[PDB]
Amino acid sequence: HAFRFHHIGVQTSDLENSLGWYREFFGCEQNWSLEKFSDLTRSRLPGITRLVELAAGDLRIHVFERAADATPAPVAEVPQFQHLCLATRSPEEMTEWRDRWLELYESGRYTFVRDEGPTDIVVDEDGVLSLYVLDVNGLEYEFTYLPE
Amino acid sequence: AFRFHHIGVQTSDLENSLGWYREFFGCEQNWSLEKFSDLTRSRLPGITRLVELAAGDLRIHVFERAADATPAPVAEVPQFQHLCLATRSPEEMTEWRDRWLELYESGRYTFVRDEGPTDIVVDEDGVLSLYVLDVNGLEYEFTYLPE
Ligand SMILES: [Fe+2]
Ligand SMILES: [Fe+2]
């Protein structure tokens, strides 16, 4: 492989809320935290106050907070990395992911940008299962099972 | 616990993004689709075509909505801000930055932004970083880890 996926950066308005939900939902760990930033970072992300690297298996997530004066909601009609898909290992885990999202949502431990619950688990004609949820920032995560 | 499968790129000009993703990343198209379930159309209203591109271990699902105009990314918004890919050698960092400038200067692709690539910077541990924008204005980072 010429290159390998390293990590994805998640911008949030409430770092504490995202750090708790990501660790609870995905089983993430905190590898390191950063509060000093170079001239290029403050130019790219004006107002960044802290960045934390999260690790859940092969997926690494760099969650960072910027202004937090307002709490805007994601825009849909705009070009974007629209969603992040994660492959499960059995059809049973698909129900597990949807159940655990609901459990964390109605537990009251977190504030969600949007109140939209998880989608149903949908089968296509080739046996693929599809499940979509929103993180605490209103960003879409897809859980799938490919009969590979 | 799980395996990262693919990222979804929402674009307004699919053929423009397809051509750039193929030349820049060396992407090859795995499959495509133009008939969608109710769930897909509810999530992405007006979706027309969906294509899975593969380059390395990374799968990229580029899809186009109702084109209409050509909107630009919004920065103040909670979002997946950037995608980082790891290189195998320090000289590849300059190879990536050069291939971006070549593809941009060729005039063969439409860009939402005029912003060129950043300089290659070094951190306290020797990690090299490089930030470029795709034809949709979305930020990609190339990194090199000495350890
Ligand atoms: Fe998807
Ligand atoms: Fe990064």
PDB file of C-alpha atoms and ligand atoms in Angstrom:
ATOM      1  CA  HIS A   1       0.000   0.000   0.000  1.00  0.00           C
ATOM      2  CA  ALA A   2       1.293   3.441  -0.974  1.00  0.00           C
ATOM      3  CA  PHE A   3      -0.280   5.021   2.118  1.00  0.00           C
ATOM      4  CA  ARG A   4      -2.305   3.937   5.142  1.00  0.00           C
ATOM      5  CA  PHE A   5      -5.167   5.699   6.899  1.00  0.00           C
ATOM      6  CA  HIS A   6      -3.820   7.186  10.137  1.00  0.00           C
ATOM      7  CA  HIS A   7      -6.625   9.140  11.827  1.00  0.00           C
ATOM      8  CA  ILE A   8      -9.618  11.421  11.309  1.00  0.00           C
ATOM      9  CA  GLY A   9     -10.091  14.801  12.975  1.00  0.00           C
ATOM     10  CA  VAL A  10     -13.397  15.539  14.703  1.00  0.00           C
ATOM     11  CA  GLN A  11     -14.264  19.149  15.528  1.00  0.00           C
ATOM     12  CA  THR A  12     -16.612  19.623  18.480  1.00  0.00           C
ATOM     13  CA  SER A  13     -18.089  22.463  20.528  1.00  0.00           C
ATOM     14  CA  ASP A  14     -17.987  20.508  23.832  1.00  0.00           C
ATOM     15  CA  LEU A  15     -14.764  18.535  24.261  1.00  0.00           C
ATOM     16  CA  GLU A  16     -15.712  17.044  27.636  1.00  0.00           C
ATOM     17  CA  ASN A  17     -19.034  15.809  26.238  1.00  0.00           C
ATOM     18  CA  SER A  18     -17.427  14.229  23.164  1.00  0.00           C
ATOM     19  CA  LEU A  19     -14.568  12.646  25.128  1.00  0.00           C
ATOM     20  CA  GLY A  20     -17.035  10.937  27.454  1.00  0.00           C
ATOM     21  CA  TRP A  21     -19.412   9.713  24.752  1.00  0.00           C
ATOM     22  CA  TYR A  22     -16.686   8.463  22.399  1.00  0.00           C
ATOM     23  CA  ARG A  23     -14.956   6.543  25.191  1.00  0.00           C
ATOM     24  CA  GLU A  24     -18.286   5.065  26.352  1.00  0.00           C
ATOM     25  CA  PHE A  25     -19.751   4.233  22.934  1.00  0.00           C
ATOM     26  CA  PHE A  26     -16.705   3.141  20.914  1.00  0.00           C
ATOM     27  CA  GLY A  27     -14.596   1.887  23.821  1.00  0.00           C
ATOM     28  CA  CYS A  28     -11.919   4.473  23.048  1.00  0.00           C
ATOM     29  CA  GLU A  29      -8.752   5.166  25.013  1.00  0.00           C
ATOM     30  CA  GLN A  30      -6.948   8.483  25.463  1.00  0.00           C
ATOM     31  CA  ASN A  31      -3.391   8.217  24.154  1.00  0.00           C
ATOM     32  CA  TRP A  32      -2.342  11.861  24.577  1.00  0.00           C
ATOM     33  CA  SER A  33      -3.713  15.377  24.979  1.00  0.00           C
ATOM     34  CA  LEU A  34      -2.408  18.612  23.492  1.00  0.00           C
ATOM     35  CA  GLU A  35      -2.916  22.275  24.370  1.00  0.00           C
ATOM     36  CA  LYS A  36       0.119  23.921  22.715  1.00  0.00           C
ATOM     37  CA  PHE A  37      -0.228  24.504  18.972  1.00  0.00           C
ATOM     38  CA  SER A  38       2.094  25.597  16.177  1.00  0.00           C
ATOM     39  CA  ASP A  39       1.646  28.667  13.991  1.00  0.00           C
ATOM     40  CA  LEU A  40       0.125  26.519  11.233  1.00  0.00           C
ATOM     41  CA  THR A  41      -2.490  24.873  13.467  1.00  0.00           C
ATOM     42  CA  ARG A  42      -3.830  28.173  14.824  1.00  0.00           C
ATOM     43  CA  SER A  43      -3.942  29.367  11.208  1.00  0.00           C
ATOM     44  CA  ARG A  44      -5.855  26.284  10.049  1.00  0.00           C
ATOM     45  CA  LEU A  45      -8.091  26.043  13.151  1.00  0.00           C
ATOM     46  CA  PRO A  46      -8.373  29.561  14.630  1.00  0.00           C
ATOM     47  CA  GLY A  47      -9.370  29.265  18.270  1.00  0.00           C
ATOM     48  CA  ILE A  48      -8.369  25.649  18.934  1.00  0.00           C
ATOM     49  CA  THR A  49      -7.943  25.141  22.680  1.00  0.00           C
ATOM     50  CA  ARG A  50      -7.294  21.405  23.105  1.00  0.00           C
ATOM     51  CA  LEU A  51      -6.811  18.284  20.977  1.00  0.00           C
ATOM     52  CA  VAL A  52      -7.034  14.696  22.258  1.00  0.00           C
ATOM     53  CA  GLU A  53      -6.171  11.517  20.355  1.00  0.00           C
ATOM     54  CA  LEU A  54      -8.663   8.681  20.832  1.00  0.00           C
ATOM     55  CA  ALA A  55      -7.979   5.076  19.824  1.00  0.00           C
ATOM     56  CA  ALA A  56     -10.559   2.331  19.214  1.00  0.00           C
ATOM     57  CA  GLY A  57      -8.762  -0.564  17.566  1.00  0.00           C
ATOM     58  CA  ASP A  58      -7.465   0.361  14.126  1.00  0.00           C
ATOM     59  CA  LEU A  59      -9.358   3.682  14.137  1.00  0.00           C
ATOM     60  CA  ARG A  60      -7.708   6.745  15.678  1.00  0.00           C
ATOM     61  CA  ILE A  61      -9.752   9.904  16.281  1.00  0.00           C
ATOM     62  CA  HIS A  62      -8.357  13.390  16.962  1.00  0.00           C
ATOM     63  CA  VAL A  63     -11.132  15.288  18.753  1.00  0.00           C
ATOM     64  CA  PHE A  64     -10.531  19.008  19.228  1.00  0.00           C
ATOM     65  CA  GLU A  65     -12.495  22.027  20.441  1.00  0.00           C
ATOM     66  CA  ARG A  66     -12.436  25.501  18.910  1.00  0.00           C
ATOM     67  CA  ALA A  67     -14.644  28.470  19.847  1.00  0.00           C
ATOM     68  CA  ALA A  68     -17.602  27.004  21.801  1.00  0.00           C
ATOM     69  CA  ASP A  69     -19.215  30.457  21.989  1.00  0.00           C
ATOM     70  CA  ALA A  70     -22.200  29.092  20.054  1.00  0.00           C
ATOM     71  CA  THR A  71     -23.248  25.463  19.554  1.00  0.00           C
ATOM     72  CA  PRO A  72     -24.036  25.203  15.826  1.00  0.00           C
ATOM     73  CA  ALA A  73     -25.402  22.077  14.169  1.00  0.00           C
ATOM     74  CA  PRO A  74     -23.848  20.311  11.159  1.00  0.00           C
ATOM     75  CA  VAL A  75     -24.872  21.429   7.666  1.00  0.00           C
ATOM     76  CA  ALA A  76     -26.081  18.781   5.212  1.00  0.00           C
ATOM     77  CA  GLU A  77     -26.243  20.515   1.799  1.00  0.00           C
ATOM     78  CA  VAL A  78     -22.524  21.368   1.996  1.00  0.00           C
ATOM     79  CA  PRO A  79     -19.560  19.318   0.679  1.00  0.00           C
ATOM     80  CA  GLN A  80     -18.183  17.352   3.599  1.00  0.00           C
ATOM     81  CA  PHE A  81     -16.867  14.095   4.929  1.00  0.00           C
ATOM     82  CA  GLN A  82     -20.502  13.139   5.367  1.00  0.00           C
ATOM     83  CA  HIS A  83     -20.200  10.009   7.514  1.00  0.00           C
ATOM     84  CA  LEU A  84     -17.779   7.414   8.870  1.00  0.00           C
ATOM     85  CA  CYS A  85     -18.476   3.708   8.387  1.00  0.00           C
ATOM     86  CA  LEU A  86     -17.313   0.904  10.685  1.00  0.00           C
ATOM     87  CA  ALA A  87     -17.545  -2.779   9.766  1.00  0.00           C
ATOM     88  CA  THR A  88     -18.883  -5.149  12.414  1.00  0.00           C
ATOM     89  CA  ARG A  89     -18.054  -8.847  12.699  1.00  0.00           C
ATOM     90  CA  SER A  90     -21.474 -10.518  13.050  1.00  0.00           C
ATOM     91  CA  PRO A  91     -25.134  -9.595  12.479  1.00  0.00           C
ATOM     92  CA  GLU A  92     -25.661  -9.822  16.245  1.00  0.00           C
ATOM     93  CA  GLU A  93     -23.292  -6.896  16.869  1.00  0.00           C
ATOM     94  CA  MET A  94     -25.497  -4.717  14.639  1.00  0.00           C
ATOM     95  CA  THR A  95     -28.313  -5.019  17.173  1.00  0.00           C
ATOM     96  CA  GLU A  96     -25.711  -4.503  19.906  1.00  0.00           C
ATOM     97  CA  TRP A  97     -24.528  -1.187  18.444  1.00  0.00           C
ATOM     98  CA  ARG A  98     -28.080   0.122  18.005  1.00  0.00           C
ATOM     99  CA  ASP A  99     -29.032  -0.957  21.534  1.00  0.00           C
ATOM    100  CA  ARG A 100     -25.967   0.671  23.099  1.00  0.00           C
ATOM    101  CA  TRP A 101     -26.568   3.958  21.272  1.00  0.00           C
ATOM    102  CA  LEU A 102     -30.087   4.116  22.709  1.00  0.00           C
ATOM    103  CA  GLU A 103     -28.816   3.151  26.170  1.00  0.00           C
ATOM    104  CA  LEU A 104     -26.242   5.959  26.154  1.00  0.00           C
ATOM    105  CA  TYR A 105     -28.742   8.453  24.715  1.00  0.00           C
ATOM    106  CA  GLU A 106     -31.524   8.035  27.283  1.00  0.00           C
ATOM    107  CA  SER A 107     -29.035   7.657  30.151  1.00  0.00           C
ATOM    108  CA  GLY A 108     -28.833  11.451  30.467  1.00  0.00           C
ATOM    109  CA  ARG A 109     -25.037  11.451  30.763  1.00  0.00           C
ATOM    110  CA  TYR A 110     -24.595  13.385  27.486  1.00  0.00           C
ATOM    111  CA  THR A 111     -25.992  16.286  25.489  1.00  0.00           C
ATOM    112  CA  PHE A 112     -26.778  15.607  21.827  1.00  0.00           C
ATOM    113  CA  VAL A 113     -26.799  18.264  19.109  1.00  0.00           C
ATOM    114  CA  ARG A 114     -29.679  16.422  17.415  1.00  0.00           C
ATOM    115  CA  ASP A 115     -32.383  14.255  18.984  1.00  0.00           C
ATOM    116  CA  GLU A 116     -32.665  11.906  15.990  1.00  0.00           C
ATOM    117  CA  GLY A 117     -32.467   8.312  17.159  1.00  0.00           C
ATOM    118  CA  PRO A 118     -30.740   5.475  15.336  1.00  0.00           C
ATOM    119  CA  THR A 119     -32.049   4.130  12.067  1.00  0.00           C
ATOM    120  CA  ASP A 120     -33.334   0.597  11.722  1.00  0.00           C
ATOM    121  CA  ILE A 121     -31.050  -2.237  10.644  1.00  0.00           C
ATOM    122  CA  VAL A 122     -31.679  -2.591   6.905  1.00  0.00           C
ATOM    123  CA  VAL A 123     -30.778  -5.494   4.593  1.00  0.00           C
ATOM    124  CA  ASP A 124     -29.979  -4.994   0.928  1.00  0.00           C
ATOM    125  CA  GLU A 125     -30.352  -7.757  -1.665  1.00  0.00           C
ATOM    126  CA  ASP A 126     -26.784  -9.002  -1.042  1.00  0.00           C
ATOM    127  CA  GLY A 127     -27.197  -9.541   2.711  1.00  0.00           C
ATOM    128  CA  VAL A 128     -25.438  -6.341   3.800  1.00  0.00           C
ATOM    129  CA  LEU A 129     -26.773  -4.836   7.031  1.00  0.00           C
ATOM    130  CA  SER A 130     -26.878  -1.058   7.466  1.00  0.00           C
ATOM    131  CA  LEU A 131     -27.155   0.998  10.653  1.00  0.00           C
ATOM    132  CA  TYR A 132     -26.696   4.753  11.054  1.00  0.00           C
ATOM    133  CA  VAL A 133     -26.326   6.729  14.285  1.00  0.00           C
ATOM    134  CA  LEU A 134     -25.335  10.264  15.253  1.00  0.00           C
ATOM    135  CA  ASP A 135     -22.588  11.218  17.681  1.00  0.00           C
ATOM    136  CA  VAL A 136     -23.039  13.951  20.285  1.00  0.00           C
ATOM    137  CA  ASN A 137     -22.089  16.532  17.626  1.00  0.00           C
ATOM    138  CA  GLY A 138     -24.681  15.423  15.070  1.00  0.00           C
ATOM    139  CA  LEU A 139     -22.109  13.630  12.907  1.00  0.00           C
ATOM    140  CA  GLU A 140     -23.209  10.419  11.223  1.00  0.00           C
ATOM    141  CA  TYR A 141     -21.614   7.034  11.924  1.00  0.00           C
ATOM    142  CA  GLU A 142     -22.484   3.953   9.867  1.00  0.00           C
ATOM    143  CA  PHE A 143     -22.315   0.443  11.297  1.00  0.00           C
ATOM    144  CA  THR A 144     -22.397  -2.301   8.674  1.00  0.00           C
ATOM    145  CA  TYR A 145     -21.905  -6.044   8.321  1.00  0.00           C
ATOM    146  CA  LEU A 146     -20.502  -7.200   4.981  1.00  0.00           C
ATOM    147  CA  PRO A 147     -20.988 -10.915   4.265  1.00  0.00           C
ATOM    148  CA  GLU A 148     -17.471 -10.634   2.846  1.00  0.00           C
TER     149      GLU A 148
ATOM    150  CA  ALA B   1     -13.691  -4.048  18.423  1.00  0.00           C
ATOM    151  CA  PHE B   2     -14.426  -2.915  14.861  1.00  0.00           C
ATOM    152  CA  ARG B   3     -12.652  -2.090  11.613  1.00  0.00           C
ATOM    153  CA  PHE B   4     -12.760   1.237   9.801  1.00  0.00           C
ATOM    154  CA  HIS B   5     -14.383   0.475   6.446  1.00  0.00           C
ATOM    155  CA  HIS B   6     -14.881   3.681   4.463  1.00  0.00           C
ATOM    156  CA  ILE B   7     -15.418   7.428   4.622  1.00  0.00           C
ATOM    157  CA  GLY B   8     -18.182   9.169   2.714  1.00  0.00           C
ATOM    158  CA  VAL B   9     -17.412  12.235   0.590  1.00  0.00           C
ATOM    159  CA  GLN B  10     -20.411  14.336  -0.449  1.00  0.00           C
ATOM    160  CA  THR B  11     -19.662  16.288  -3.627  1.00  0.00           C
ATOM    161  CA  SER B  12     -21.556  18.510  -6.055  1.00  0.00           C
ATOM    162  CA  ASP B  13     -19.579  17.369  -9.142  1.00  0.00           C
ATOM    163  CA  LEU B  14     -19.008  13.619  -8.867  1.00  0.00           C
ATOM    164  CA  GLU B  15     -17.186  13.246 -12.186  1.00  0.00           C
ATOM    165  CA  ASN B  16     -14.857  16.093 -11.202  1.00  0.00           C
ATOM    166  CA  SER B  17     -14.059  14.488  -7.840  1.00  0.00           C
ATOM    167  CA  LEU B  18     -13.737  11.020  -9.396  1.00  0.00           C
ATOM    168  CA  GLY B  19     -11.158  12.263 -11.888  1.00  0.00           C
ATOM    169  CA  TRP B  20      -9.122  14.034  -9.209  1.00  0.00           C
ATOM    170  CA  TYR B  21      -9.278  11.228  -6.635  1.00  0.00           C
ATOM    171  CA  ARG B  22      -8.059   8.795  -9.302  1.00  0.00           C
ATOM    172  CA  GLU B  23      -5.084  10.900 -10.407  1.00  0.00           C
ATOM    173  CA  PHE B  24      -4.027  12.175  -6.974  1.00  0.00           C
ATOM    174  CA  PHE B  25      -4.495   9.139  -4.712  1.00  0.00           C
ATOM    175  CA  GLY B  26      -4.216   6.496  -7.427  1.00  0.00           C
ATOM    176  CA  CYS B  27      -7.791   5.468  -6.656  1.00  0.00           C
ATOM    177  CA  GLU B  28      -9.457   2.634  -8.553  1.00  0.00           C
ATOM    178  CA  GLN B  29     -13.236   2.296  -8.674  1.00  0.00           C
ATOM    179  CA  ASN B  30     -14.613  -0.854  -7.033  1.00  0.00           C
ATOM    180  CA  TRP B  31     -18.350  -0.495  -7.693  1.00  0.00           C
ATOM    181  CA  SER B  32     -21.072   2.072  -8.318  1.00  0.00           C
ATOM    182  CA  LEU B  33     -24.794   2.441  -7.696  1.00  0.00           C
ATOM    183  CA  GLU B  34     -27.701   4.582  -8.894  1.00  0.00           C
ATOM    184  CA  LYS B  35     -30.717   2.850  -7.293  1.00  0.00           C
ATOM    185  CA  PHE B  36     -31.001   3.430  -3.557  1.00  0.00           C
ATOM    186  CA  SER B  37     -33.116   2.161  -0.685  1.00  0.00           C
ATOM    187  CA  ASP B  38     -35.525   4.335   1.287  1.00  0.00           C
ATOM    188  CA  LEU B  39     -33.019   4.639   4.139  1.00  0.00           C
ATOM    189  CA  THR B  40     -30.293   5.980   1.842  1.00  0.00           C
ATOM    190  CA  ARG B  41     -32.651   8.497   0.234  1.00  0.00           C
ATOM    191  CA  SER B  42     -33.843   9.655   3.660  1.00  0.00           C
ATOM    192  CA  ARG B  43     -30.268  10.226   4.842  1.00  0.00           C
ATOM    193  CA  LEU B  44     -29.058  11.863   1.600  1.00  0.00           C
ATOM    194  CA  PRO B  45     -32.099  13.406  -0.126  1.00  0.00           C
ATOM    195  CA  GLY B  46     -31.557  13.827  -3.847  1.00  0.00           C
ATOM    196  CA  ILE B  47     -28.723  11.293  -4.067  1.00  0.00           C
ATOM    197  CA  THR B  48     -28.005  10.378  -7.695  1.00  0.00           C
ATOM    198  CA  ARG B  49     -24.872   8.214  -7.885  1.00  0.00           C
ATOM    199  CA  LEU B  50     -22.606   6.504  -5.346  1.00  0.00           C
ATOM    200  CA  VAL B  51     -19.105   5.185  -6.081  1.00  0.00           C
ATOM    201  CA  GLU B  52     -16.657   3.313  -3.837  1.00  0.00           C
ATOM    202  CA  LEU B  53     -13.022   4.225  -4.511  1.00  0.00           C
ATOM    203  CA  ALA B  54     -10.098   2.299  -3.040  1.00  0.00           C
ATOM    204  CA  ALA B  55      -6.515   3.483  -2.562  1.00  0.00           C
ATOM    205  CA  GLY B  56      -4.384   1.581  -0.086  1.00  0.00           C
ATOM    206  CA  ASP B  57      -6.335   0.373   2.932  1.00  0.00           C
ATOM    207  CA  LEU B  58      -8.767   3.296   2.546  1.00  0.00           C
ATOM    208  CA  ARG B  59     -12.180   3.045   0.892  1.00  0.00           C
ATOM    209  CA  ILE B  60     -13.852   6.311  -0.137  1.00  0.00           C
ATOM    210  CA  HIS B  61     -17.560   6.488  -1.010  1.00  0.00           C
ATOM    211  CA  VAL B  62     -17.998   9.559  -3.216  1.00  0.00           C
ATOM    212  CA  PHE B  63     -21.637  10.414  -3.917  1.00  0.00           C
ATOM    213  CA  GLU B  64     -23.474  13.331  -5.517  1.00  0.00           C
ATOM    214  CA  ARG B  65     -26.698  14.961  -4.343  1.00  0.00           C
ATOM    215  CA  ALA B  66     -28.886  17.467  -6.201  1.00  0.00           C
ATOM    216  CA  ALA B  67     -26.098  19.465  -7.856  1.00  0.00           C
ATOM    217  CA  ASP B  68     -27.921  22.826  -8.143  1.00  0.00           C
ATOM    218  CA  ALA B  69     -25.123  25.347  -7.424  1.00  0.00           C
ATOM    219  CA  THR B  70     -21.681  24.487  -6.008  1.00  0.00           C
ATOM    220  CA  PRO B  71     -21.618  25.058  -2.244  1.00  0.00           C
ATOM    221  CA  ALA B  72     -18.419  25.304  -0.222  1.00  0.00           C
ATOM    222  CA  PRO B  73     -17.420  23.645   3.073  1.00  0.00           C
ATOM    223  CA  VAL B  74     -18.470  25.337   6.313  1.00  0.00           C
ATOM    224  CA  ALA B  75     -15.685  25.571   8.885  1.00  0.00           C
ATOM    225  CA  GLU B  76     -17.388  26.791  12.097  1.00  0.00           C
ATOM    226  CA  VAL B  77     -19.545  23.659  12.153  1.00  0.00           C
ATOM    227  CA  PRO B  78     -19.148  20.323  13.990  1.00  0.00           C
ATOM    228  CA  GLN B  79     -17.663  18.141  11.283  1.00  0.00           C
ATOM    229  CA  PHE B  80     -15.184  15.479  10.311  1.00  0.00           C
ATOM    230  CA  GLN B  81     -12.553  18.141   9.748  1.00  0.00           C
ATOM    231  CA  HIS B  82      -9.717  16.316   7.985  1.00  0.00           C
ATOM    232  CA  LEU B  83      -8.502  12.896   6.877  1.00  0.00           C
ATOM    233  CA  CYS B  84      -4.926  11.870   7.657  1.00  0.00           C
ATOM    234  CA  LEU B  85      -2.905   9.347   5.652  1.00  0.00           C
ATOM    235  CA  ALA B  86       0.503   8.014   6.682  1.00  0.00           C
ATOM    236  CA  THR B  87       3.408   7.876   4.232  1.00  0.00           C
ATOM    237  CA  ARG B  88       6.206   5.310   4.181  1.00  0.00           C
ATOM    238  CA  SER B  89       9.151   7.669   3.570  1.00  0.00           C
ATOM    239  CA  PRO B  90      10.017  11.342   4.200  1.00  0.00           C
ATOM    240  CA  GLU B  91      10.562  12.100   0.509  1.00  0.00           C
ATOM    241  CA  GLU B  92       7.000  10.935  -0.217  1.00  0.00           C
ATOM    242  CA  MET B  93       5.811  14.004   1.707  1.00  0.00           C
ATOM    243  CA  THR B  94       7.330  16.236  -0.967  1.00  0.00           C
ATOM    244  CA  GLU B  95       6.134  13.814  -3.658  1.00  0.00           C
ATOM    245  CA  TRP B  96       2.552  14.293  -2.448  1.00  0.00           C
ATOM    246  CA  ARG B  97       2.876  18.083  -2.260  1.00  0.00           C
ATOM    247  CA  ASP B  98       4.361  18.187  -5.770  1.00  0.00           C
ATOM    248  CA  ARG B  99       1.654  15.980  -7.303  1.00  0.00           C
ATOM    249  CA  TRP B 100      -1.009  18.269  -5.827  1.00  0.00           C
ATOM    250  CA  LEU B 101       0.519  21.395  -7.376  1.00  0.00           C
ATOM    251  CA  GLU B 102       0.887  19.569 -10.698  1.00  0.00           C
ATOM    252  CA  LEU B 103      -2.746  18.434 -10.783  1.00  0.00           C
ATOM    253  CA  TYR B 104      -3.949  21.893  -9.743  1.00  0.00           C
ATOM    254  CA  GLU B 105      -1.824  23.750 -12.307  1.00  0.00           C
ATOM    255  CA  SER B 106      -2.933  21.383 -15.077  1.00  0.00           C
ATOM    256  CA  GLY B 107      -6.336  23.082 -15.165  1.00  0.00           C
ATOM    257  CA  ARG B 108      -8.036  19.707 -15.689  1.00  0.00           C
ATOM    258  CA  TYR B 109     -10.089  19.886 -12.465  1.00  0.00           C
ATOM    259  CA  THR B 110     -12.415  22.361 -10.763  1.00  0.00           C
ATOM    260  CA  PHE B 111     -11.546  23.414  -7.209  1.00  0.00           C
ATOM    261  CA  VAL B 112     -13.889  24.875  -4.603  1.00  0.00           C
ATOM    262  CA  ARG B 113     -10.917  26.626  -2.966  1.00  0.00           C
ATOM    263  CA  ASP B 114      -7.873  28.483  -4.274  1.00  0.00           C
ATOM    264  CA  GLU B 115      -5.796  27.591  -1.200  1.00  0.00           C
ATOM    265  CA  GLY B 116      -2.551  25.816  -2.013  1.00  0.00           C
ATOM    266  CA  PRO B 117      -0.862  23.182   0.109  1.00  0.00           C
ATOM    267  CA  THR B 118       0.817  24.126   3.357  1.00  0.00           C
ATOM    268  CA  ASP B 119       4.521  23.760   3.996  1.00  0.00           C
ATOM    269  CA  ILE B 120       5.859  20.492   5.383  1.00  0.00           C
ATOM    270  CA  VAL B 121       6.292  21.093   9.121  1.00  0.00           C
ATOM    271  CA  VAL B 122       8.048  19.139  11.880  1.00  0.00           C
ATOM    272  CA  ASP B 123       6.866  18.618  15.458  1.00  0.00           C
ATOM    273  CA  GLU B 124       8.718  17.894  18.702  1.00  0.00           C
ATOM    274  CA  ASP B 125       9.057  14.183  17.828  1.00  0.00           C
ATOM    275  CA  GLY B 126      10.036  14.600  14.170  1.00  0.00           C
ATOM    276  CA  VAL B 127       6.571  13.937  12.737  1.00  0.00           C
ATOM    277  CA  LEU B 128       6.125  15.540   9.320  1.00  0.00           C
ATOM    278  CA  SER B 129       2.753  17.037   8.389  1.00  0.00           C
ATOM    279  CA  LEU B 130       1.214  18.376   5.180  1.00  0.00           C
ATOM    280  CA  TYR B 131      -2.307  19.727   4.630  1.00  0.00           C
ATOM    281  CA  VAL B 132      -3.938  19.822   1.186  1.00  0.00           C
ATOM    282  CA  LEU B 133      -7.493  20.417  -0.015  1.00  0.00           C
ATOM    283  CA  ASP B 134      -9.412  18.217  -2.434  1.00  0.00           C
ATOM    284  CA  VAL B 135     -11.576  19.479  -5.299  1.00  0.00           C
ATOM    285  CA  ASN B 136     -14.451  19.815  -2.799  1.00  0.00           C
ATOM    286  CA  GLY B 137     -12.488  22.001  -0.366  1.00  0.00           C
ATOM    287  CA  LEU B 138     -12.102  19.145   2.132  1.00  0.00           C
ATOM    288  CA  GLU B 139      -8.809  18.980   4.010  1.00  0.00           C
ATOM    289  CA  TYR B 140      -6.458  15.996   3.802  1.00  0.00           C
ATOM    290  CA  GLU B 141      -3.317  15.562   5.897  1.00  0.00           C
ATOM    291  CA  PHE B 142      -0.248  13.552   4.938  1.00  0.00           C
ATOM    292  CA  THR B 143       1.979  12.470   7.820  1.00  0.00           C
ATOM    293  CA  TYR B 144       5.282  10.670   8.294  1.00  0.00           C
ATOM    294  CA  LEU B 145       6.058   9.020  11.624  1.00  0.00           C
ATOM    295  CA  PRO B 146       9.759   8.236  12.209  1.00  0.00           C
ATOM    296  CA  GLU B 147       8.771   5.826  15.011  1.00  0.00           C
TER     297      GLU B 147
HETATM  298 FE    FE C   1     -21.687   4.662   3.712  1.00  0.00          FE
HETATM  299 FE    FE C   2      -4.295  15.652  12.005  1.00  0.00          FE
END
